Design an enzyme around this catalytic site. Structure first.
Site, PDB file in Angstrom:
ATOM      1  CB  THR A  37       0.154   3.506   9.930  1.00 24.55           C
ATOM      2  OG1 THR A  37      -0.558   2.842   8.329  1.00 24.55           O
ATOM      3  CG2 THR A  37      -1.287   3.002  10.277  1.00 24.55           C
ATOM      4  CG  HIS A 191       2.805   2.735   0.100  1.00 28.51           C
ATOM      5  ND1 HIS A 191       2.440   2.123   1.384  1.00 28.51           N
ATOM      6  CD2 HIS A 191       3.945   3.407   0.403  1.00 28.51           C
ATOM      7  CE1 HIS A 191       3.700   2.324   2.429  1.00 28.51           C
ATOM      8  NE2 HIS A 191       4.171   2.957   1.856  1.00 28.51           N
ATOM      9  CG  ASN A 194       7.555   2.920   3.750  1.00 34.88           C
ATOM     10  OD1 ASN A 194       9.548   3.070   4.073  1.00 34.88           O
ATOM     11  ND2 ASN A 194       6.629   3.734   3.507  1.00 34.88           N
ATOM     12  CE1 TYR A 196       3.244  -2.189   5.920  1.00 37.37           C
ATOM     13  CE2 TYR A 196       4.675  -0.391   4.926  1.00 37.37           C
ATOM     14  CZ  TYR A 196       4.032  -1.399   6.125  1.00 37.37           C
ATOM     15  OH  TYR A 196       4.361  -0.727   7.303  1.00 37.37           O
ATOM     16  CG  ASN A 251       7.614  -3.978   6.812  1.00 34.85           C
ATOM     17  OD1 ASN A 251       7.709  -4.565   8.151  1.00 34.85           O
ATOM     18  ND2 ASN A 251       6.637  -2.851   6.625  1.00 34.85           N
TER      19      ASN A 251
END
Ligand SMILES: Cc1cc2nc3c(=O)[nH]c(=O)nc-3n(C[C@H](O)[C@H](O)[C@H](O)COP(=O)(O)O)c2cc1C
Ligand SMILES: COC(=O)/C=C(\C#N)c1ccccc1
Ligand SMILES: [Cl-]
Length: 397
Positions: A37, A191, A194, A196, A251
């Site tokens: 990103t 994904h 991480n 999310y 996260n």
């Protein structure tokens, strides 16, 4: 300038420089650009950057036969929440992605779109502004106090997804995958790492559900596997990979402190191998190493020494991409690539070295990265890092 103290090693004599096939793509070496990103997409509409994105990817595609995984791309407005990350749901977005995929292919490299859904990592105020929910697995545990507060202030409290809403996300994953392939991408990466949304379902800290999507290993894996199955059906197993970070804490995921974490991920790998043996093998599994439990800590920090991803190899028998602090550690890469189905993702140093592959082959110095411009609305720190030739001309030696 170049990284000081770093002692490069030429890796040309290792399997890092042996060709390998991933999905439909004949890679010429095993140095992969992992998803990164960069926040150059423009608002409104989450549009890939009209000025610089083609150049950015063109630079990093320069070594023929390189596999590039894109920055995370939102599958839908509801999946987003960062104004400057791109989406793959709209015609205006795909116009720009098409240009990007064409440029990468002109350089004889390959491109896989990472499909992203934020869950509790999204900004609740952006979502509220756009009339969207703030979503996660559960509604009684939060990423941090600040996110919980932002959500309440925005009258957009964290919402535990209903089964119908999960199905809607799955529909959007399917359409995003289709969009990506139609625009020219070689495949997609789901994904599920991480911290999310999919990771929020996998992890027992963030998933306190008592329905079929939580409360056990099989239940916590359900959403991720439904997305895998939906995309395999839509565009084929050869065009689909999956990213996981078993030991990640970014996260607010559990990492190794959760004694059941290896079992949770071993179950997912097992279900993938089961599908592979039944004739639908994913193109790859991409793992973040415990070498980097949080990618916003400097290399060497946040390294978990109490766990290994090696377990995955006993279960999943296809290609494995491993990422995490490998650029500064050619001595580790030299050992890992002795395994003949292992590829290495290089993240932060691909930001700063567009010709990283040449530098790895030949044992050249590496450009230092500038973390301040990782996320920035600028060409600076995006498309103006020099190749080794350019660096020498600037006197960096
Ligand atoms: C600025 C930045 C952006 C990233 N964006 C993504 C992303 O969009 N999707 C993803 O799965 N990982 C993302 N990552 C994690 C990286 O893909 C990679 O796993 C991590 O940086 C560790 O590898 P490295 O030490 O080679 O940088 C990002 C990392 C950084 C530093
Ligand atoms: C659109 O996808 C993203 O925004 C992805 C990240 C952000 N921000 C991201 C994902 C994994 C690791 C670090 C950042
Ligand atoms: Cl192994």
């Amino acid at each position: 300038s170049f990284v000081k103290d770093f002692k490069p090693q030429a890796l040309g004599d290792t399997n890092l420089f042996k060709p390998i096939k991933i999905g439909n793509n004949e890679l010429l070496h095993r140095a992969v650009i992992p998803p990164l990103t960069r926040m150059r997409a423009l608002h409104p509409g989450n549009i890939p950057n009209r000025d610089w994105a083609v150049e950015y990817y063109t630079q990093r595609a320069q070594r023929p036969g390189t596999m590039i995984i894109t920055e995370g791309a939102f599958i839908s407005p509801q999946a987003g929440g960062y104004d400057n990350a791109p989406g793959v749901w709209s015609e205006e977005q795909m116009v720009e992605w098409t240009k990007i995929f064409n440029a990468i292919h002109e350089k004889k490299s390959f491109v896989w779109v990472q499909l992203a859904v934020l869950g509790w990592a999204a900004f609740p105020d952006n979502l509220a502004r756009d009339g969207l929910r703030y979503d996660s697995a559960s509604d009684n545990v939060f990423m941090d106090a600040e996110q919980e507060a932002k959500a309440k202030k925005a009258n957009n409290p964290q919402h535990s997804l209903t089964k119908d809403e999960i199905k809607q996300y799955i529909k959007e994953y399917v359409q995003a995958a289709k969009n990506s392939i139609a625009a020219g991408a070689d495949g997609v990466e789901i994904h599920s790492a991480n911290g999310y949304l999919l990771n929020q379902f996998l992890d027992p800290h963030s998933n306190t559900r008592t329905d079929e999507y939580g409360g056990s290993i099989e239940n916590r894996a359900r959403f991720t596997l439904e997305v895998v199955d939906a995309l395999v059906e839509a565009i084929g197993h050869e065009k689909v990979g999956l990213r996981l970070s078993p030991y990640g804490v970014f996260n607010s995921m559990s990492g190794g402190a959760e004694t059941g974490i290896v079992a949770q991920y071993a179950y997912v790998a097992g279900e993938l191998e089961k599908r592979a043996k039944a004739g639908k093998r994913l193109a790859f599994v991409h793992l973040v190493e415990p070498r980097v439990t949080n990618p916003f800590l400097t290399e060497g920090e946040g390294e978990y020494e109490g766990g290994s991803n090696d377990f995955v190899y006993s279960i999943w028998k296809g290609p494995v991409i491993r990422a995490g602090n490998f650029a500064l550690h050619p001595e580790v890469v030299r050992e890992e690539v002795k395994d003949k189905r292992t590829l290495i993702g290089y993240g932060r140093f691909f930001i700063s070295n567009p010709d990283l592959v040449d530098r790895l082959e030949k044992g050249l110095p590496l450009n230092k990265y500038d973390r301040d411009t990782f996320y920035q609305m600028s060409a600076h720190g995006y498309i103006d890092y020099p190749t080794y030739e350019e660096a020498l001309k600037l006197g960096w030696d």
